[PDB]
Structure formats: structure tokens, C-alpha cells
Design a protein around this ligand. Structure first.
Ligand SMILES: CNC(=O)[C@H](Cc1ccncc1)NC(=O)[C@@H]1C[C@@H](C2CCCCC2)CN1C(=O)C[C@H](N)c1ccco1
Length: 183
């Protein structure tokens, strides 16, 4: 779409186990860990990261590649979200996400979550927000922009952040990084 937005990963939110491309456009789970600052922003608990970008208004679209990725988590979230210590990922916290785990088991971050029934495993996912509309939707690029799922009447109060994770590499097959597409 035209409402496109150039997103960079904020390393001041990145979980210590995550390696970033120097361009802030990839992110993947490292076997070992980084020994980095004591920021009130970093995700301690799980392999999660935001994008530096802050939306207070308007309509914003971006795309993410997940070729060869048995799991992942994409979407948006409030700044407000607490960044310290275990939680449930849900609209209820301040996350409007979808995700994948165990290769073929896609679900939406409703409280509680909602299994999804997808004609075509998406190779890239398109994410789209309309702050004023209370809207954020997920589109299956690899199947002619088919709506994977839409969150509606979200309560968009404070500012909003692009949310990501490449998920866990236990299976072996989650080496591959979330790659942001250039459009
Ligand atoms: C019961 N909730 C679940 O089973 C879902 C399942 C799920 C799996 C994959 N992708 C998103 C969701 N987990 C969560 O909501 C959170 C986030 C998640 C992370 C973050 C994304 C990357 C790696 C996985 C693991 N997770 C916890 O461990 C919370 C924990 N059980 C708890 C409940 C109360 C307080 O803490």
C-alpha cells in the first residue's frame, strides 16, 4: 500500500538473547546472551522487540518476512505495556498481535486467544494500523493480501509501537530472522 512506513528496531527494547542487523531491519535469537545497560524499556522475560517509531495518529502499513520460521509474533502495542517479567500476550495487556508456534498453529492475541484457519502459510505478513479507526489488521501477502485477522474497536489512548519476536529456536528451526521488507 501507499501508507507504507520505514521501521527500525529500537535496541533499547530488545531482549538480551536477540541479535540485530546493524541497519535495524533484521532480528534473530542468539544461542548466548548480551551484557548491556539497565533500561526501564528492555524486555527481560521473552525474546520481544519494538520499533523506534511512535504513532499518535494517521494510518501506517509495513511488511515482515518469515520464510522458514516455525514460530514468530508480529503486531502493535501501547508504550504503556510493562517491559519487566512474565505476562500473558493479549489485547488485555496492550498488544494487538497474531503469532505462530509449532510450525502450523497460527492464532490471534485475543483474550483469550483465537485459533486462525489459513488457506496459505504466509511467507511475508503485512501489518496495517488506523489509530483514529481503533483498527489494526494483518494481511497475508503470499495469498494476494488476504486478511489473516483484524482487531477492531481497540482503545487507542496513548502512543503505539511496532511489536516483534522471532520466537524460540528449541526445535532447531527458528534460526531465520524476522526481516522487515523494503516495499
Ligand atoms: C497462557 N499463554 C500462552 O500460552 C501464550 C502462548 C503463546 C505462544 C507463542 N506466542 C505467543 C503466545 N504465551 C503468552 O501469552 C506469553 C508470551 C509468550 C512468549 C512471547 C512471544 C515469543 C516467545 C513466547 C510466552 N508467554 C508466557 O510464557 C506467559 C506465561 N505462561 C504467563 C501466564 C501468566 C503470566 O505469565
Amino acid at each position: 500500500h501507499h501508507h507504507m512506513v520505514h521501521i527500525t528496531l529500537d535496541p533499547d527494547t530488545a531482549n538480551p538473547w536477540l541479535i540485530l542487523s546493524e541497519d535495524r531491519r533484521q532480528v534473530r535469537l542468539g544461542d548466548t546472551q548480551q551484557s548491556i545497560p539497565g533500561n526501564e524499556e528492555r524486555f527481560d522475560s521473552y525474546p520481544m522487540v519494538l520499533g523506534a517509531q511512535h504513532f499518535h495518529s494517521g494510518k501506517h502499513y509495513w511488511e515482515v518476512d518469515v520464510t522458514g520460521k516455525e514460530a514468530w509474533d508480529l503486531g502493535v502495542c501501547r508504550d504503556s505495556v510493562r517491559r519487566k517479567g512474565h505476562f500473558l500476550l493479549s489485547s488485555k495487556s496492550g498488544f494487538w498481535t497474531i503469532w505462530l508456534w509449532n510450525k502450523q498453529k497460527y492464532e490471534a492475541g485475543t483474550y483469550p486467544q483465537t485459533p486462525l484457519h489459513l488457506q496459505v502459510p504466509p511467507c511475508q505478513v503485512g501489518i496495517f494500523l488506523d489509530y483514529e479507526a481503533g483498527m489494526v489488521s494483518f494481511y497475508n501477502i503470499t495469498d494476494h493480501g488476504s486478511l489473516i485477522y483484524s482487531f477492531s474497536e481497540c482503545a487507542f489512548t496513548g502512543p503505539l509501537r511496532p511489536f516483534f519476536s522471532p520466537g524460540f529456536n528449541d526445535g532447531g528451526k527458528n534460526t531465520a530472522p524476522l526481516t522487515l521488507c523494503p516495499l
